Amino acid sequence: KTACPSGKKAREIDESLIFYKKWELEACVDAALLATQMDRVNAIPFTYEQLDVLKHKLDELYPQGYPESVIQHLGYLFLKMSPEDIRKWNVTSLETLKALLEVNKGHEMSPQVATLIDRFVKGRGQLDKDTLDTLTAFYPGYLCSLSPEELSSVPPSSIWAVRPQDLDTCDPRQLDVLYPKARLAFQNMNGSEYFVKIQSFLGGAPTEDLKALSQQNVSMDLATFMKLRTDAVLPLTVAEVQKLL
Ligand SMILES: *[C@@H]1O[C@H](CO)[C@@H](O)[C@H](O)[C@H]1NC(C)=O
Numbered sequence: 217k218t219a220c221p222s223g224k225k226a227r228e229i230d231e232s233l234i235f236y237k238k239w240e241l242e243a244c245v246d247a248a249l250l251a252t253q254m255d256r257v258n259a260i261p262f263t264y265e266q267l268d269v270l271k272h273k274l275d276e277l278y279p280q281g282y283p284e285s286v287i288q289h290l291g292y293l294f295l296k297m298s299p300e301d302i303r304k305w306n307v308t309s310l311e312t313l314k315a316l317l318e319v320n321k322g323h324e325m326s327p328q329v330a331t332l333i334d335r336f337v338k339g340r341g342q343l344d345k346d347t348l349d350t351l352t353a354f355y356p357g358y359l360c361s362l363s364p365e366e367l368s369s370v371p372p373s374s375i376w377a378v379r380p381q382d383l384d385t386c387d388p389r390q391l392d393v394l395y396p397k398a399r400l401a402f403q404n405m406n407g408s409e410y411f412v413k414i415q416s417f418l419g420g421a422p423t424e425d426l427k428a429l430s431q432q433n434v435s436m437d438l439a440t441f442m443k444l445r446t447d448a449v450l451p452l453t454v455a456e457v458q459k460l461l
Pocket residue numbers: 280281282283304305306
């Protein structure tokens with residue numbers, strides 16, 4: 217059954233291929249043709265095994281990792297992707313990254329997705345704001361999942377993207393690294409514009425900065441009061457504490 221049956225030699229990727237058997241797709245469908253017209257696959261209602269064949273073709277064609285040409289239109293092939301394979305990928309455009317993450321909506325960060333992001337960010341060089349926006353959209357609890365030392369490398373610019381709900385899972389050792397960045401990030405912003413944004417990062421704020429906030433008529437919430445460093449609220453006086461209330 218090596219040869220493709222006469223007449224079934226597919227010149228184009230189309231809906232006819234759903235009728236084909238596993239070996240027929242392995243015989244008839246050329247890999248080079250599939251790679252070019254990979255944008256059609258998500259349209260065609262293929263079966264489980266049929267996709268495995270299409271996936272196998274790409275490995276044969278691209279032993280050294282797929283190009284971004286193909287990656288963009290992977291779709292539900294991404295689900296059947298090996299972790300080592302993704303390490304080869306050189307993804308750059310964020311529109312690529314969105315499409316991949318949109319196949320695993322709702323679910324937890326799969327091994328594949330985890331390996332994709334680490335490779336993505338290495339390629340960029342730094343964790344961008346635009347990067348964070350997309351990551352936090354699909355996976356809110358990302359920043360807290362990063363190890364404290366990795367957060368040190370994170371530029372102050374990216375803190376714009378972070379939201380109050382994103383830091384819920386963060387332990388205080390992470391907030392100690394994020395606070396000075398947030399402080400550098402939200403600079404030149406006088407008044408309540410300072411306060412409203414820093415609310416969250418106060419969880420890792422020294423005592424010297426708490427005395428500064430007291431005298432600027434902030435009127436801090438009492439919910440925020442509770443989420444402060446126990447060690448770094450000892451030098452601060454009750455007089456100073458009263459000015460935050
Ligand atoms: C990624 O880029 C490196 C350096 O240009 C190259 O050696 C490698 O083959 C690329 N990986 C891909 C796109 O398969």
